Amino acid sequence: MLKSNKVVLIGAGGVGSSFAYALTIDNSLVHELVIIDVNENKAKGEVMDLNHGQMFLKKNINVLFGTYKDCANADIVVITAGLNQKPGETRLDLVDKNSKIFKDIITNVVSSGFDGIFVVASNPVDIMTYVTMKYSKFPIHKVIGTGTILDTSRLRYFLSDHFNVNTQNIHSYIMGEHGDSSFATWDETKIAMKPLSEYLAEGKITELELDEIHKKVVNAAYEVIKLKGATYYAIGLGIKNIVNAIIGDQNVILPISSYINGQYGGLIKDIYIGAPAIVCKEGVKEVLNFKISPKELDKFNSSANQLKSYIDKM
Amino acid sequence: MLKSNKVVLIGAGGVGSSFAYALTIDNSLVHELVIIDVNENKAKGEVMDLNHGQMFLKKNINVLFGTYKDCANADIVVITAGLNQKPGETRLDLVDKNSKIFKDIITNVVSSGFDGIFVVASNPVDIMTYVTMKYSKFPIHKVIGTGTILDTSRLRYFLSDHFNVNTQNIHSYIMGEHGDSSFATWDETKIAMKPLSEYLAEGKITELELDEIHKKVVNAAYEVIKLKGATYYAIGLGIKNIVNAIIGDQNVILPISSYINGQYGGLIKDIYIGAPAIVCKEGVKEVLNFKISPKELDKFNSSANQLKSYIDKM
Amino acid sequence: MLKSNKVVLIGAGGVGSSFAYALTIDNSLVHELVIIDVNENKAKGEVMDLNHGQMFLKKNINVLFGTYKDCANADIVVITAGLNQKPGETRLDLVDKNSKIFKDIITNVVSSGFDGIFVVASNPVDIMTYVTMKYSKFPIHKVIGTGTILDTSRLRYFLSDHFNVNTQNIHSYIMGEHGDSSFATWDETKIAMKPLSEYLAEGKITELELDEIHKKVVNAAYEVIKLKGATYYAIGLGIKNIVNAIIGDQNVILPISSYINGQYGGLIKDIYIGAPAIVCKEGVKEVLNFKISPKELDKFNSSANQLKSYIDKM
Amino acid sequence: MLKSNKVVLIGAGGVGSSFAYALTIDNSLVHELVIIDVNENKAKGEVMDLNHGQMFLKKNINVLFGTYKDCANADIVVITAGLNQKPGETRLDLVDKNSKIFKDIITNVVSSGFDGIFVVASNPVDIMTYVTMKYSKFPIHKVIGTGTILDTSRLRYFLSDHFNVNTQNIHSYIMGEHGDSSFATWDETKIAMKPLSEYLAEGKITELELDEIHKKVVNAAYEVIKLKGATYYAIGLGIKNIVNAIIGDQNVILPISSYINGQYGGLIKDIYIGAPAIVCKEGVKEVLNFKISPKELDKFNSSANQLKSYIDKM
Ligand SMILES: NC(=O)C1=CN([C@@H]2O[C@H](COP(=O)(O)OP(=O)(O)OC[C@H]3O[C@@H](n4cnc5c(N)ncnc54)[C@H](O)[C@@H]3O)[C@@H](O)[C@H]2O)CC=C1
Ligand SMILES: NC(=O)C1=CN([C@@H]2O[C@H](COP(=O)(O)OP(=O)(O)OC[C@H]3O[C@@H](n4cnc5c(N)ncnc54)[C@H](O)[C@@H]3O)[C@@H](O)[C@H]2O)CC=C1
Ligand SMILES: NC(=O)C1=CN([C@@H]2O[C@H](COP(=O)(O)OP(=O)(O)OC[C@H]3O[C@@H](n4cnc5c(N)ncnc54)[C@H](O)[C@@H]3O)[C@@H](O)[C@H]2O)CC=C1
Ligand SMILES: NC(=O)C1=CN([C@@H]2O[C@H](COP(=O)(O)OP(=O)(O)OC[C@H]3O[C@@H](n4cnc5c(N)ncnc54)[C@H](O)[C@@H]3O)[C@@H](O)[C@H]2O)CC=C1
Ligand SMILES: O=P(O)(O)OC[C@H]1O[C@](O)(COP(=O)(O)O)[C@@H](O)[C@@H]1O
Ligand SMILES: O=P(O)(O)OC[C@H]1O[C@](O)(COP(=O)(O)O)[C@@H](O)[C@@H]1O
Ligand SMILES: [Ca+2]
Ligand SMILES: [Ca+2]
């Protein structure tokens, strides 16, 4: 028998609503979308606005107001609820209030009988991913965070604009914390099959331009927050892509919040951090391990140690 | 010689930003999108947030922050600028305020050298379409408004849920003013090829339920605004579909703001009103005419009389 | 838990391979496509040629060379095996040959343990749908034939070309036997919301032109076969759309081979004939019933009698 | 302002017909498709079969039978005409006859007033691309051949199946002549960011397995021809993607038939060979140059020397 695939969204603010809109437009078999928000009226209005556009979609989809009960037979639970950062605030300044919000959300979600896959976007996303795994008691491979997918998308856009080359051919990652301590894989970067070192040697880009691009990646959230209050379009597309990759069993490699336990030298273990992993219908299929340059490995270790600090204080 | 297709968006609020997002996701050959707003910080932030997600799109697209000089070589100009209605404000006061804003907008656009197609969504949409045509001097067929496309989408969603049939197969229109004096084409409505009269005969639905549906359509915007502050997702998809129909030269029939001068009895002439028209690459190719029932014609003439009353004043 | 949707294709000729190609390009979550043919070299070559293009697809898909063992857990079985016709599709000789082929195919499929949905395209498609239902003993709502979907596609193309209007807005059907006894629903046809009778009265089309268009629909297959040897592109798309509507649970109304039992004047009963029905994840959800004009009802009854007599002689 | 993008297809065999089909299904705005074949009946039949499925397509498209006269205002001309291999023949046996055919076709097209972009697929594709350039006297950037895009697609499918990873993450090329002298960029290959050398070290792939995969790439065409008479699905998708990337001004890097005059050492110059280049609205924006291993450079220079040996004999 054929099945009805169900996604429950928890948190109907800018990020969640953008994700839901994008998913209705570009849908890899999501038959039911259930929206949950502690602000009941916001969720109701978003459900209405999404349903009023069905005539313009490629496919019809069931979009419903829901409660935690709906998670019982959900295949995916997307969590975007929590406080976002205000001007002058880091993502780590949200750890305490957002962890308390996630203790409550994860209890309800677990008590309903949910046994699908978690997709976490709330900040700080790596620590919130670890918290989801611990509170839920779920296997490590059924808990996914968006990690550095958004930072990587920003990096690839900036490089695409610099070289006037489609983002599809920009093979570079942001790894580490989804935050101030991230780093770019400059030494492993290629444009199609042409290494970045050849572009540097040819004077088509400079090392300080690389430093500036990485700093723009790091500061992008702060800039967009100053300009329009919060970021939601790019993260909405990233979540949509993760969801479709899961439902489609696409076995695609993405730089997500991945649980490391021996990879990248093993100096730091048992944390979630921005790193490449294979995604499929069962969740994470494998957390990859590849050699990165010594300086880049020191940056990775420093970022992972920063994360481990917060994990140890709880 | 292949060309670069350029769309300029004026007004980066909820409607305009939602349209731009939807267009980048489902893009029928827009190479360059230019976003303009009197609040330039908002426009900058939306440009950045839209660009940061390029890695997740099917196609790359140039999204830019611009000025009115960018309209010179634009192919389409989408206008979503102006005020949305507030409590205690009739359609007359918004007509006044928004026509005064459009004078400035259209003056700058036309002075830039623009000679493309106008797509208008600011409310009251039919009157603002008339105003755009009068201020711009453009041929009537080069000025399009969204008309009752959103009301028709709401109607077809309601009917699809009632009969549990895909919106694709709900053949019914909302016509007249985009507002309180609109009406449904009940007597000409079909579900696939089965007339609504048959469903009525079989107790599949009742006249009361039909009145209920029409009033749901009339009050949808008020409900959504109560619940979440504004509507923008469904209107964004509608505008995206219009723009793609134009660039794709699809010759598709839609219930837009159409210029009547003889159709539907011809008792009211020389106004834009929600009615079916064929849309193609050069704009409106034909405003159609078909027989509606006498009671529905009474409703149509009343709505057109209302719109003509507001126009003649100025 | 999430599942892998499995489609088995029996018959890897022009029609089957066209359908498989179109499905790989436009895929509503088919995870596994299995191809079977009594000519195993042909099935293998098609599997290889379809897999060699995965790089260019939106989504990866597992394309497999199969045996009947693969039907055990298949969700849909598409049958396009059988002799293609230079002369009459509904020859009693062709009926006999393809009935003998279907006996073997259905026996092997059913002995595999399959319990999904049959989608039949082999000719004569209405009688082959009947034979599939009889040999398999499946519920009638789990046996689908393509019926007059192809004839309706041709009709809507011809009308779209006549009026220079998108096929989207052409609301007309071909009904009755997929072949020489079919008829068009001229008296119920609409262009968008405009009845065809209004176009006739305005001189934009004539009765003779309607007759000629219907004869073009009837002679299309013969002409295409004369020119290029066989037809497979339009029918491949029709099969693809049926499959995607089923897996997407879209509740869409399609003119398929439907099991008639009282509808349309309850004269002929218990045969498969071209008629509109609601398609969903469950199979056929309902055969629709609406009033046709007396002349068209007579055409329909004559077509049904044609079919029943050919079933008798089998 | 907005235009109708016109593609003329010359050669309506399996390759051309598959490309046309795929294009109608996945269309980056091609408003008019014109089909030319010296066998007028085959072209007519293909036009009819393609048009009879418009109702199932996302967008309507104008498909017409035509003559050389129709290239006058064409934006793109795709050439798929000429002899195919058949069992026992290499692709280099066909040079003489196909060069004669191409002389005829190019002369007619150029005489028609066409000044757009050629896209060449007929075999041997590198030599036929060179011949198109020479006979047409067009700028080099106006002439595109499919080169090793098909070989690369086969390679990426084989590696995707071996590692069970999406083709999207397989970064490897086939370069050199589309034929028996090609080679794979093993030393520069990555699965996402993970070099192939690490998979070899970890025993997840072996040197003999790389040898075998390249041999499979080289013998794929012979095997598929033996099994079903000819290859056309994978090549059709490749052509479709080139066309959509041109019209979409996507600036994508593809391994196509590129004109070399200094790259990859100065050894062989002034020929077309399988190599990466940037494709955009104007044609070829830039032929890339990147370092490959010394043994692979030897292979590249031997392949190029063979192609030069053929070009000099004429
Ligand atoms: N790359 C990434 O992962 C990104 C992370 N982001 C974070 O995502 C989260 C949401 O951001 P925004 O949408 O802009 O914020 P928002 O102000 O729009 O609020 C999101 C929603 O969460 C709701 N909520 C709060 N508590 C609960 C609860 N217990 N159950 C259900 N709903 C609840 C709340 O009512 C609100 O509607 C923040 O933590 C952001 O920092 C935002 C941008 C990118
Ligand atoms: N056609 C339809 O069906 C509907 C029409 N809608 C109307 O669309 C318009 C925009 O709606 P929202 O996005 O929600 O409102 P909004 O406040 O969110 O955005 C309106 C934008 O217009 C900007 N603006 C104001 N004046 C000017 C100016 N002189 N020049 C340039 N920019 C200016 C302004 O800065 C703001 O960003 C309103 O008139 C709505 O009533 C909204 C909903 C549906
Ligand atoms: N429903 C519709 O609208 C249409 C129906 N069509 C019919 O579809 C069928 C196939 O058409 P084509 O592909 O062009 O013909 P084809 O000869 O190209 O393909 C038929 C395939 O079926 C194979 N086959 C034969 N017997 C068996 C068997 N016992 N088991 C498995 N495979 C077998 C056979 O080897 C061949 O590959 C014919 O009956 C057509 O008449 C064709 C056009 C439209
Ligand atoms: N990666 C690649 O580039 C590949 C190249 N391929 C080659 O593409 C070409 C076509 O392959 P197929 O479609 O299978 O062969 P086909 O015989 O099926 O079709 C070729 C068509 O070209 C027609 N034709 C011949 N001369 C002219 C002319 N002067 N004007 C117009 N039409 C003409 C001819 O009538 C025929 O219909 C062959 O040369 C193949 O070797 C096929 C596979 C892949
Ligand atoms: O022209 P309308 O009335 O707006 O309907 C358009 C819709 O009709 C359809 O063609 C379906 O029509 P049918 O139900 O008659 O088959 C859809 O594809 C299309 O979106
Ligand atoms: O594996 P990555 O680095 O995430 O890149 C994924 C992208 O690479 C591509 O496969 C293109 O690869 P190439 O540049 O090597 O041709 C895109 O299709 C895909 O979106
Ligand atoms: Ca740039
Ligand atoms: Ca015509």
Side-chain angles (χ1 to χ4, degrees):
Chain A
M1 59 144 201
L2 290 156
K3 166 179 165 91
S4 181
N5 302 317
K6 192 182 187 181
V7 177
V8 170
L9 173 69
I10 303 180
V15 180
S17 302
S18 291
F19 154 62
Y21 194 45
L23 177 68
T24 63
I25 297 161
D26 195 51
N27 194 354
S28 99
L29 237 75
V30 167
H31 289 103
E32 304 181 284
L33 177 64
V34 176
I35 296 181
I36 289 172
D37 196 295
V38 80
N39 183 345
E40 310 257 80
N41 287 0
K42 182 59 154 66
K44 283 165 144 64
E46 296 296 357
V47 173
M48 293 180 37
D49 206 10
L50 291 156
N51 275 322
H52 294 174
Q54 297 254 355
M55 161 191 230
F56 307 113
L57 306 174
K58 184 206 196 172
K59 290 173 284 244
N60 279 199
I61 178 187
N62 301 305
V63 194
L64 291 319
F65 177 96
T67 69
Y68 280 108
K69 323 308 304 149
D70 294 274
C71 297
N73 63 337
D75 303 288
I76 299 167
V77 168
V78 168
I79 304 182
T80 77
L83 288 317
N84 64 30
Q85 53 204 133
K86 295 247 172 233
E89 241 197 318
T90 67
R91 292 167 186 90
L92 301 179
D93 291 340
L94 317 171
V95 174
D96 289 331
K97 61 196 161 259
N98 285 22
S99 63
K100 237 64 63 53
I101 290 156
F102 264 64
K103 190 204 298 135
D104 187 30
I105 288 159
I106 298 299
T107 315
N108 298 105
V109 170
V110 159
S111 94
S112 88
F114 172 72
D115 86 303
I117 290 153
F118 283 101
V119 181
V120 179
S122 315
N123 267 325
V125 71
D126 308 300
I127 291 131
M128 290 307 93
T129 302
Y130 186 83
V131 157
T132 302
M133 183 270 313
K134 285 258 101 180
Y135 278 147
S136 74
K137 280 167 57 202
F138 271 39
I140 51 89
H141 73 85
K142 295 172 157 164
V143 189
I144 287 158
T146 71
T148 48
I149 210 173
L150 175 60
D151 312 75
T152 290
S153 195
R154 282 160 173 160
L155 169 73
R156 294 197 180 195
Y157 160 66
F158 291 132
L159 287 170
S160 168
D161 188 23
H162 181 97
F163 289 109
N164 302 316
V165 164
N166 197 285
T167 58
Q168 271 185 293
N169 302 123
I170 307 298
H171 305 296
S172 193
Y173 282 166
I174 291 295
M175 282 173 73
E177 171 208 17
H178 173 64
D180 294 345
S181 78
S182 71
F183 76 95
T185 58
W186 288 134
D187 285 315
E188 300 78 22
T189 297
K190 293 184 167 172
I191 315 293
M193 298 282 287
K194 180 171 174 88
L196 186 61
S197 50
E198 288 182 30
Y199 285 99
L200 288 155
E202 290 152 29
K204 281 138 189 209
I205 195 170
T206 78
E207 295 278 355
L208 251 199
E209 288 170 330
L210 298 186
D211 180 71
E212 180 170 21
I213 281 161
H214 171 62
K215 269 149 182 186
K216 287 233 296 295
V217 168
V218 159
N219 286 345
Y222 307 122
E223 271 295 296
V224 178
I225 277 157
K226 169 182 136 34
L227 289 174
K228 63 177 231 181
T231 92
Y232 36 84
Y233 286 145
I235 185 55
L237 296 183
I239 298 166
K240 187 256 290 164
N241 272 20
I242 287 168
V243 162
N244 283 341
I246 286 168
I247 293 162
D249 193 43
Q250 282 300 289
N251 285 334
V252 290
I253 296 171
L254 296 175
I256 62 188
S257 292
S258 302
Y259 187 85
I260 52 165
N261 69 315
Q263 294 93 344
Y264 305 112
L267 315 95
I268 318 298
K269 293 194 171 73
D270 301 302
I271 63 146
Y272 280 95
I273 191 158
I278 294 151
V279 181
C280 70
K281 74 191 259 223
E282 292 80 19
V284 180
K285 198 224 282 279
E286 160 179 350
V287 173
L288 256 78
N289 191 27
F290 72 111
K291 318 317 130 191
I292 77 177
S293 82
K295 47 167 173 321
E296 274 165 38
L297 180 54
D298 271 10
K299 293 157 187 229
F300 185 81
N301 289 327
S302 155
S303 179
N305 195 77
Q306 255 273 285
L307 283 166
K308 189 104 179 144
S309 87
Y310 287 78
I311 286 175
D312 280 345
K313 83 97 186 150
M314 81 195 35
Chain B
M1 216 153 37
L2 288 155
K3 141 181 191 54
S4 174
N5 292 325
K6 183 172 192 170
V7 174
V8 174
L9 170 72
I10 306 173
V15 177
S17 302
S18 292
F19 152 66
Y21 192 47
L23 176 65
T24 73
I25 293 157
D26 179 21
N27 178 4
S28 103
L29 214 69
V30 174
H31 295 95
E32 183 179 343
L33 179 65
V34 176
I35 295 174
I36 288 166
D37 202 287
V38 64
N39 175 4
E40 67 248 77
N41 280 6
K42 180 57 149 72
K44 289 181 212 119
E46 298 298 358
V47 167
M48 301 175 55
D49 204 4
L50 294 165
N51 273 321
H52 291 173
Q54 295 249 5
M55 153 182 184
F56 305 118
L57 305 176
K58 183 190 154 145
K59 321 173 170 89
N60 278 200
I61 176 178
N62 217 250
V63 183
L64 307 161
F65 173 65
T67 51
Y68 285 109
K69 295 206 199 173
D70 275 281
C71 290
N73 68 323
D75 305 291
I76 297 162
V77 165
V78 183
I79 306 181
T80 70
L83 290 313
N84 33 31
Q85 84 155 309
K86 317 190 253 253
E89 281 217 311
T90 67
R91 284 310 68 89
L92 181 294
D93 309 308
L94 207 70
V95 176
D96 197 54
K97 290 185 144 276
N98 276 354
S99 61
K100 283 202 163 68
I101 285 162
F102 266 51
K103 200 177 326 203
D104 178 40
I105 285 170
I106 306 304
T107 281
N108 280 119
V109 173
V110 169
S111 92
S112 80
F114 174 67
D115 59 29
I117 296 164
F118 280 106
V119 164
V120 176
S122 318
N123 268 318
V125 69
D126 303 303
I127 299 204
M128 294 318 299
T129 299
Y130 189 88
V131 166
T132 294
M133 177 277 288
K134 281 256 139 190
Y135 285 168
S136 75
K137 301 333 182 141
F138 273 34
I140 63 193
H141 66 87
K142 270 194 160 356
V143 187
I144 290 163
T146 60
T148 46
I149 198 170
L150 175 53
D151 304 278
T152 295
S153 190
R154 278 156 181 162
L155 168 64
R156 288 190 193 195
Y157 159 68
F158 295 135
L159 291 168
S160 148
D161 183 11
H162 186 274
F163 292 107
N164 301 299
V165 167
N166 195 285
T167 57
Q168 263 177 242
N169 300 125
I170 307 305
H171 305 300
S172 181
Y173 280 171
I174 293 273
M175 289 166 60
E177 175 215 0
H178 172 60
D180 304 326
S181 74
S182 72
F183 65 98
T185 54
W186 292 131
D187 291 320
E188 302 83 359
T189 293
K190 287 190 173 187
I191 316 294
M193 285 222 325
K194 183 171 168 84
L196 192 55
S197 65
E198 298 188 2
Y199 287 98
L200 280 158
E202 293 155 34
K204 271 29 178 307
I205 196 179
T206 85
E207 302 281 337
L208 191 166
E209 302 187 293
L210 294 185
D211 197 53
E212 174 89 339
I213 291 171
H214 173 63
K215 304 184 122 291
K216 267 209 151 117
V217 169
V218 165
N219 300 308
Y222 305 116
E223 286 294 307
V224 176
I225 289 150
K226 277 175 227 123
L227 291 161
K228 55 173 283 201
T231 89
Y232 35 84
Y233 284 145
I235 187 55
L237 296 179
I239 295 161
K240 182 263 283 171
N241 270 37
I242 289 165
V243 163
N244 282 347
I246 283 146
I247 289 154
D249 199 34
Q250 285 297 288
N251 282 335
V252 68
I253 296 166
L254 296 164
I256 48 155
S257 298
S258 300
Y259 194 85
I260 59 170
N261 54 346
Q263 299 92 328
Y264 305 99
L267 161 54
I268 287 101
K269 305 203 232 178
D270 295 335
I271 62 157
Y272 285 93
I273 196 157
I278 297 170
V279 170
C280 73
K281 178 156 47 60
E282 253 80 26
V284 181
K285 145 163 97 146
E286 174 163 33
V287 172
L288 302 166
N289 192 23
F290 70 114
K291 162 150 109 73
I292 57 199
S293 80
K295 72 153 295 154
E296 277 161 30
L297 191 66
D298 273 30
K299 289 184 200 143
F300 185 87
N301 284 327
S302 179
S303 191
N305 201 74
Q306 180 121 20
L307 279 164
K308 182 146 214 65
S309 139
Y310 277 65
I311 286 169
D312 290 353
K313 308 212 172 72
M314 304 306 106
Chain C
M1 294 311 238
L2 294 169
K3 99 183 218 82
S4 153
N5 301 322
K6 190 182 208 170
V7 177
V8 173
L9 171 67
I10 304 172
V15 172
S17 300
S18 297
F19 152 69
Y21 195 44
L23 181 66
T24 65
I25 298 165
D26 181 34
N27 184 1
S28 94
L29 224 67
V30 173
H31 293 103
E32 261 169 65
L33 179 59
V34 181
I35 294 165
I36 290 171
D37 199 295
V38 62
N39 178 349
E40 290 175 53
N41 277 4
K42 183 65 156 57
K44 287 191 252 257
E46 291 305 351
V47 162
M48 276 160 77
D49 204 4
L50 292 167
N51 272 320
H52 289 172
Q54 297 254 0
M55 198 194 110
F56 314 111
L57 306 170
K58 179 182 158 154
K59 303 175 252 232
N60 280 202
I61 173 174
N62 293 2
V63 186
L64 301 173
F65 168 63
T67 78
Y68 279 107
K69 309 199 305 294
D70 283 294
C71 300
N73 67 336
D75 309 284
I76 299 177
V77 164
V78 177
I79 306 185
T80 83
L83 276 296
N84 43 46
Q85 31 86 233
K86 98 68 24 218
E89 300 163 32
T90 322
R91 205 217 238 175
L92 199 75
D93 211 346
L94 203 90
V95 156
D96 289 333
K97 292 171 270 212
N98 285 354
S99 271
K100 267 134 204 87
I101 286 163
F102 260 62
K103 162 63 100 153
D104 194 42
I105 282 165
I106 294 292
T107 308
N108 285 313
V109 167
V110 165
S111 90
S112 79
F114 173 70
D115 75 343
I117 293 147
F118 282 104
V119 172
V120 176
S122 316
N123 262 334
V125 62
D126 308 293
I127 293 164
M128 275 324 148
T129 307
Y130 191 72
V131 167
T132 297
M133 182 270 294
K134 289 275 131 146
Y135 289 160
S136 70
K137 309 150 136 93
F138 276 28
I140 61 161
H141 72 92
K142 303 236 274 189
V143 185
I144 289 161
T146 62
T148 51
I149 218 173
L150 176 58
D151 315 77
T152 294
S153 196
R154 283 161 178 158
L155 173 66
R156 294 193 178 191
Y157 162 64
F158 294 142
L159 287 164
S160 159
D161 187 25
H162 187 96
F163 293 105
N164 301 309
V165 171
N166 197 281
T167 59
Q168 269 177 223
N169 306 115
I170 306 301
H171 305 300
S172 187
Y173 287 142
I174 299 292
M175 283 176 75
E177 167 249 39
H178 177 16
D180 297 308
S181 40
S182 71
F183 71 95
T185 58
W186 288 134
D187 287 354
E188 303 66 47
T189 292
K190 291 179 102 143
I191 310 292
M193 294 288 273
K194 189 169 161 87
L196 191 70
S197 51
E198 294 185 19
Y199 282 103
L200 278 158
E202 293 156 30
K204 287 152 185 145
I205 192 166
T206 73
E207 308 280 347
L208 182 43
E209 266 160 355
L210 301 179
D211 180 36
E212 281 152 342
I213 281 163
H214 174 73
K215 288 273 102 201
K216 267 214 280 199
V217 173
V218 167
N219 285 114
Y222 306 109
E223 256 313 308
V224 186
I225 281 146
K226 276 138 184 178
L227 287 157
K228 89 182 208 157
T231 94
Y232 38 79
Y233 287 142
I235 184 55
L237 290 175
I239 301 168
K240 186 262 279 172
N241 273 240
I242 295 170
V243 166
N244 277 351
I246 284 156
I247 283 155
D249 196 36
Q250 285 295 297
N251 280 337
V252 285
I253 288 158
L254 289 172
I256 51 166
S257 290
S258 300
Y259 189 83
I260 305 288
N261 165 249
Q263 302 94 346
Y264 311 116
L267 214 77
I268 295 283
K269 329 179 50 200
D270 296 304
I271 45 143
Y272 279 100
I273 203 164
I278 302 173
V279 160
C280 66
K281 141 162 74 58
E282 187 203 310
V284 182
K285 169 160 155 232
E286 149 166 320
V287 174
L288 208 73
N289 197 3
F290 61 93
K291 206 187 161 188
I292 46 172
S293 74
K295 296 182 322 294
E296 298 175 358
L297 185 55
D298 289 355
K299 287 153 163 24
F300 187 79
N301 276 301
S302 184
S303 202
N305 288 341
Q306 253 301 20
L307 279 170
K308 177 77 198 174
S309 70
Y310 259 108
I311 282 170
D312 284 349
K313 273 119 73 194
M314 220 154 60
Chain D
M1 31 154 255
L2 284 166
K3 77 198 295 271
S4 171
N5 301 323
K6 193 192 197 160
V7 177
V8 172
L9 169 72
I10 308 190
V15 172
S17 292
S18 300
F19 151 67
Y21 193 44
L23 178 72
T24 69
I25 298 167
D26 193 66
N27 191 6
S28 95
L29 253 188
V30 166
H31 291 92
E32 172 151 336
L33 178 58
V34 169
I35 300 176
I36 293 167
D37 200 295
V38 76
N39 179 345
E40 281 205 27
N41 285 350
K42 178 61 145 70
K44 267 138 164 178
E46 291 306 349
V47 166
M48 300 177 13
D49 207 359
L50 292 164
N51 272 324
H52 293 175
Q54 299 253 359
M55 155 193 212
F56 305 118
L57 302 170
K58 195 192 148 142
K59 301 182 287 252
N60 277 202
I61 182 184
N62 220 288
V63 188
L64 305 173
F65 163 89
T67 53
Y68 287 124
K69 155 135 72 203
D70 293 295
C71 299
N73 69 326
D75 301 290
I76 297 175
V77 167
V78 178
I79 297 154
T80 65
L83 279 66
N84 59 18
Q85 286 163 264
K86 103 167 294 204
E89 310 203 2
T90 68
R91 307 156 160 102
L92 296 171
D93 291 319
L94 320 163
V95 176
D96 32 32
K97 317 230 77 175
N98 280 356
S99 336
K100 283 141 178 77
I101 290 159
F102 262 68
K103 183 150 111 133
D104 181 66
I105 294 161
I106 300 283
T107 301
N108 280 103
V109 171
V110 171
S111 265
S112 85
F114 168 78
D115 57 16
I117 299 160
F118 288 107
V119 178
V120 177
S122 313
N123 259 329
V125 61
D126 303 303
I127 296 174
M128 291 309 89
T129 303
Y130 180 84
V131 161
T132 301
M133 182 272 283
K134 268 286 172 213
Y135 281 136
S136 75
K137 315 186 141 229
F138 274 31
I140 77 90
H141 74 276
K142 244 47 184 304
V143 186
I144 288 165
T146 54
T148 49
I149 190 47
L150 179 57
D151 313 80
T152 294
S153 196
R154 287 163 173 157
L155 170 67
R156 285 187 189 199
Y157 160 66
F158 292 142
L159 291 166
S160 168
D161 182 17
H162 180 90
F163 293 105
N164 295 320
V165 166
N166 198 287
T167 53
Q168 256 177 77
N169 298 125
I170 308 298
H171 305 302
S172 201
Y173 283 155
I174 300 285
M175 277 169 87
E177 177 225 35
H178 158 59
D180 293 337
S181 55
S182 76
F183 70 95
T185 61
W186 289 130
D187 293 317
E188 302 81 17
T189 293
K190 295 189 152 163
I191 314 309
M193 291 267 108
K194 194 168 156 78
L196 190 66
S197 65
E198 289 180 24
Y199 286 99
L200 287 159
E202 299 157 38
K204 286 165 172 158
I205 197 157
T206 80
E207 299 284 336
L208 216 55
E209 280 164 348
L210 307 182
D211 196 43
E212 171 177 41
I213 284 158
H214 182 245
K215 287 191 208 310
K216 267 159 81 103
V217 167
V218 159
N219 293 334
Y222 305 119
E223 277 315 304
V224 174
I225 285 165
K226 182 198 146 233
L227 290 166
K228 69 177 230 159
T231 90
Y232 35 88
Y233 287 144
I235 184 55
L237 293 171
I239 296 168
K240 185 258 293 178
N241 274 222
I242 288 154
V243 165
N244 279 348
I246 291 163
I247 290 158
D249 200 21
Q250 283 298 290
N251 286 317
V252 290
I253 288 163
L254 292 174
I256 56 162
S257 292
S258 305
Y259 190 77
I260 47 160
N261 206 43
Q263 295 96 338
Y264 305 108
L267 210 153
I268 290 129
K269 311 207 247 283
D270 302 289
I271 59 152
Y272 283 89
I273 201 171
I278 301 174
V279 175
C280 75
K281 167 161 55 78
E282 296 294 309
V284 184
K285 163 158 94 131
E286 164 176 358
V287 171
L288 294 192
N289 198 17
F290 75 103
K291 288 316 115 180
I292 42 165
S293 68
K295 303 247 207 293
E296 295 170 1
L297 192 66
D298 283 356
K299 288 160 153 124
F300 188 82
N301 286 330
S302 104
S303 191
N305 201 88
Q306 189 160 357
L307 285 162
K308 192 115 173 117
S309 98
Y310 274 91
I311 287 161
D312 279 331
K313 282 179 62 121
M314 23 177 273

